[PDB]
Design a protein around this nucleic acid. Structure first.
Ligand code: 9O7
Ligand code: MG
Length: 748
DNA sequence: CGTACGCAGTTCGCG
DNA sequence: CGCGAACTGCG
């Protein structure tokens, strides 16, 4: 099995290192024959004598063109003649890249920014996470002493806990009488003992939770001050910290640092992403949280340290139990995309698409287009197109509604119609597929680049979905849904990649066509089911609709639904297939993207309502459900109002716990870039003002205290809330949190 | 580093 | 006030 891939320099030459695990033994394979390169297109081949002479300057020593090779490739399915410009060191490319392209006889250059380590995996056709090996895992967390206003890692690390298959332990430099706590003299020896523990166990994977932005950065600065060689890598190297825009990423050579934070973000939608909330959402078990203020009081006074030891212990145990479940999903994801687990688990949709396309483009001798410069990126940013069709819903209560949705509509349209930049308006074809509204033509004489790839991705999604119904244990089935939902978003991401401003294969006309076909296929199917089968589409969004048959019983509307499915599926071309997504007893439709339905088993399904939105407190989500049950299950509006008065009167009497009054909202940029300061911004700013780091993606959890004026003026972080000192705003959480979401529903 | 558009809903400043 | 803008998140 291939774990990762990097390169070192030996006498000026790059040496690709392949970290592998075969037959249960970690090994390092060396390749000193790979040479960096990038392509260049010229006007006349006579200029090749002048391009070889082009030199640049890299830290004193000169850099020259090592070797050249005229090769025959294809640029978007069309023949192209480029020259392979070879170089000694990979870092020689960024020094001479702009100057070779600057030659008057050079049209453009290509493939000059692919990292040399990833270039080795693509060119040699290596796929990581392949094989029968069972990796060894070990999670770890740290408990650090904090005081308001102190610099990062100014206070010392108090405890270092680790966990794996043999249990969990904590290392601290103060006496704690618990059987799983190893007592130690000083903090430096505590860090040293943990370093020896990782070395003795030699885990291939290191599980952390936000270790990319805290744990490894804290252990680093502490090791600098204490003079410790924190050699965690299998080559005796210290963990490297990398910058990724606004967040940091930490790599460990020879192993795989599996930070659980970015994985859970792209996998589960939660109002808060604390380790305690994530552990509860996945396993159904509650985790106690000890705050940075109590741990200080426990350390300076000495009493209560046993409680803090359990917190750090559980922090490592919870992280190992969480990492043991989500690694198999990312391992297969690393297999499909073709990049290491370390890079894939931290990447969004844009690179998960482009990396797989880069690997497949090399297989087909397809010269990859370049990422746009700053200007072309800004031009594609403002560029947009029409999206999906949303019908203004039919208001009122309705009976016996069925939900019909298209199966992978956007990927089906891409493959059925061969939507691809190497296909868009290709000259000389005998068969075309014209898109409605936009009018873009697409050749069909041969499978396009992207459509030939998107086929296998849908099969993988249907492979996990088929395993979901066959699995009975509630935990595995929950993880398989996360898996399929991860592949489903990845598949539709190939459409968004067409309109992605930083995409190499950016094809806006491809993106306009996909949504244009999507709008035509949903509006035609809606009309067909209304005039030909007697259905009545009450609401529709992009690729699905809810429609009953007036006066018909349940069994007939379900039988006629599957009947219409065979009719429209026999009329749809290619992979377009309408699916039966479920039957609903009674259903509500307030407005666009907001509805509430009940099923035959009395379960309440909602869409886009405040019950799901994060920026609504729990007392709002709790009350809305009670009004939703009385209306859809009990069918009685008067009790629904009676529930509201009881909750509203409860907030007035200061009777609801402050845990059910926390409003969460995510920071989406640097705090200085904000133009309008809301409540969650006013709290985020007051955290960076006193030392608390705030990066984009941070979820601000605040509570609104009693006062007058701006809501953000009296909003404080919930961790700062003490019920003896702060009294929450009874009127705000009434008039602004509970009534509006229910009053909008009670309009019916 | 950073998939797409559509659109309901809230906070805030202000005339 | 309540529109207009900024802002978020869901589907
Ligand atoms: N995050 C997204 N980014 C881009 N396009 C998307 C996204 N989500 C959905 N689409 C596309 O927008 C329309 C459609 O959304 P469904 O997710 O509701 O349906 P499937 O088609 O995914 O597959 P199933 O029905 O789950 O078997 C999808 O094609
Ligand atoms: Mg669908």
């Amino acid at each position: 099995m291939i774990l990762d891939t990097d390169y070192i320099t030996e006498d000026g030459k790059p040496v690709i290192r392949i970290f592998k695990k075969e037959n249960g033994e970690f090994k390092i394979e060396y390749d000193r024959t790979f040479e960096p390169y990038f392509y260049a297109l010229l006007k006349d081949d006579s200029a090749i004598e002048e391009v070889k002479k082009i030199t640049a300057e890299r830290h004193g020593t000169v850099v020259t063109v090592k070797r050249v090779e005229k090769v025959q490739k294809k640029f978007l399915g069309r023949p192209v003649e480029v020259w392979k410009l070879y170089f000694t060191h990979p870092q020689d490319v960024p020094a001479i890249r702009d100057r070779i392209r600057a030659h008057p006889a050079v049209v453009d250059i290509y493939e000059y920014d692919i990292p040399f380590a990833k270039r080795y995996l693509i060119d040699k056709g290596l796929i990581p996470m392949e094989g029968d090996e069972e990796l060894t895992m070990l999670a770890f967390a740290i408990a650090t002493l904090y005081h308001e206003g102190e610099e990062f890692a100014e206070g010392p690390i108090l405890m270092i806990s680790y966990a794996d298959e043999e249990g969990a332990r904590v290392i601290t430099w103060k006496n704690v009488d618990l059987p799983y706590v190893d007592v130690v003299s000083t903090e430096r020896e505590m860090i040293k003992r943990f370093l020896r523990v990782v070395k003795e166990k030699d885990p291939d994977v290191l599980i952390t939770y936000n270790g990319d932005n805290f744990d490894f950065a804290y252990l680093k600065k502490r090791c600098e001050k204490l003079g410790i060689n924190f050699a965690l890598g299998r080559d005796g190297s210290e963990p490297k910290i990398q910058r990724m825009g606004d967040r940091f990423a930490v790599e460990v050579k020879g192993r795989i640092h599996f930070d659980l934070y970015p994985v859970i973000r792209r996998t589960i939608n939660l109002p808060t992403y604390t380790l305690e909330a994530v552990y509860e959402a996945v396993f159904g078990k509650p985790k106690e949280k000890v705050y940075a203020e109590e741990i200080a009081q426990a350390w300076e006074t000495g009493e209560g340290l046993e409680r803090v030891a359990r917190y750090s212990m559980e922090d490592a145990k919870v992280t190992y139990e969480l990492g043991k479940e989500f690694l198999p999903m990312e391992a297969q994801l690393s297999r499909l995309v073709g990049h290491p687990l370390w890079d894939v688990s931290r990447s969004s949709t844009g690179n998960l698409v482009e990396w797989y396309l880069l690997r497949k483009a090399y297989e087909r001798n397809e010269l990859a287009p370049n990422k746009p410069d700053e200007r072309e990126y800004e031009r594609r940013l403002r560029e947009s197109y029409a999206g999906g069709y949303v019908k203004e819903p039919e208001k009122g209560l309705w009976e016996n509604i069925v939900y019909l949705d298209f199966r992978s509509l956007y990927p089906s349209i891409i493959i059925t119609h061969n939507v691809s930049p190497d296909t868009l308006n290709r000259e000389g074809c005998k068969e075309y597929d014209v898109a409605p509204q936009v009018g873009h033509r697409f050749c069909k004489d041969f499978p396009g680049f992207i459509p030939s790839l998107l086929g296998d991705l849908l099969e993988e999604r249907q492979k996990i979905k088929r395993k979901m119904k066959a699995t009975v244990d509630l935990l595995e089935k929950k993880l398989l849904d996360y898996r399929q939902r991860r592949i489903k978003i990845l598949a539709s991401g190939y459409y968004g990649y067409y309109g992605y401003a930083r995409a190499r294969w950016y094809c806006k006309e491809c993106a306009e066509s996909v949504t244009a076909w999507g709008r035509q296929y949903i509006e035609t199917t809606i009309r067909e089911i209304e005039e030909k089968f007697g259905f009545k589409v009450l609401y529709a969004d992009t690729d699905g609709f809810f429609a009953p048959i007036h006066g018909a019983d349940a069994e007939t509307v379900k039988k006629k639904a599957k009947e219409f499915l065979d009719y429209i599926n026999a009329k749809l071309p290619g992979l377009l297939e309408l699916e039966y997504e479920g039957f609903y007893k009674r259903g509500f439709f307030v407005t666009k993207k907001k509805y509430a339905v009940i099923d035959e088993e009395d379960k309440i399904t909602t869409g886009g309502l405040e019950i799901v939105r994060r920026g609504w407190s729990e007392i709002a989500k709790e009350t809305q459900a009670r009004v939703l049950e009385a209306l859809l299950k009990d069918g009685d509006v008067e009790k629904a109002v009676r529930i509201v008065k009881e909750v509203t009167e409860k907030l007035s009497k200061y009777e609801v716990p402050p845990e059910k009054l926390v409003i969460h909202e995510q920071i989406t940029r640097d705090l200085r870039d904000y133009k309008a300061t809301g409540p969650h911004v006013a709290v985020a700013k007051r955290l960076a003002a006193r030392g608390v780091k705030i990066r984009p993606g941070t979820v601000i959890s605040y509570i609104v205290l009693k006062g007058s004026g701006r809501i953000g003026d009296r909003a404080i972080s919930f961790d700062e809330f003490d019920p003896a000192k702060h009294k929450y705003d009874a009127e705000y959480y009434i008039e602004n949190q509970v009534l509006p979401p229910v009053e909008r529903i009670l309009r019916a």
